[PDB]
């Protein structure tokens, strides 16, 4: 369920199959590295940072589930253990860098609950700017000091 | 009927109102610079290389019209004249450059007649690449040697 973004050879971050779309932050330069998937029509949000394409029907099963669902507590990323509390993801500063936007966050069922546009370095913790639903629609949040990656 | 592009400040090409669509080229970085346009969703592909919204009902009658008619002669755009011979827009070279992405070339009656993609240095004349209509439908025609603008 996940593509690598690459410009010039160099992977840039990611695209995910999330619900029936391919997913990509906006800000992330580059192709997605399937020549089938950059050539899909993309719903482009300047606003929430996120291009979304509908999934080839044959992709359709590759797919992660999605929920609004975020209890505190922690989540699973591709480096480890994502922290969730008082509204705001972190992860240990130095885990994520430039080149890990795209990558889904999720929880124990697999379902996913962000993606990863940055993070804030706040010192030993970073908090982590995503894509993000709520029960009605999705969001875009940001901290402070956030690096885009 | 022609609005600016901008990223960081700096103009980095352009959309125009043609039809019922915002047209801009989806390579060129950046937002548009319209408060209502720049809070639309976009559907961008690289097929055509175009970023296409519906304009907004309050700026529908200041769109241009177009045409896929296309005899040879000479057409219009922001620096003079534009030759048109043998399915081919060509300009002098230097005329367009880096940043002239997404200008308009029209037709006497002041129909749009393509969206200027980029160019084909070919010595003292440069080939547009550009987005024009064939019939009712939107294609992409590059010459050989384009260089996105």
Not at 63 to 72: G, L, Q, R
Request: glycine share 12%.
């Amino acid at each position: 369920c996940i593509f690598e973004v690459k410009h010039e050879g160099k992977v840039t971050g990611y695209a995910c199959l999330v619900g029936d779309k391919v997913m990509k932050p906006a800000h992330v330069p580059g192709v997605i590295d399937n020549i089938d998937l950059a050539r899909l029509s993309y719903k482009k949000s300047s606003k929430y940072d996120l291009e979304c394409a509908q999934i080839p029907v044959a992709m359709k099963s590759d797919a992660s589930k999605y929920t609004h669902e975020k209890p505190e507590g922690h989540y699973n990323w591709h480096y480890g253990a994502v922290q969730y509390t008082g509204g705001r993801f972190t992860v240990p500063t130095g885990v994520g860098k430039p080149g890990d936007s795209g990558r889904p966050i999720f929880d124990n069922k697999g379902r996913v609950v962000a993606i990863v546009l940055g993070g804030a370095n706040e010192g030993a913790r970073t908090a982590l700017s995503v894509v993000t639903w709520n029960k009605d629609m999705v969001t875009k949040i940001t901290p402070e000091g956030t690096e885009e990656w």
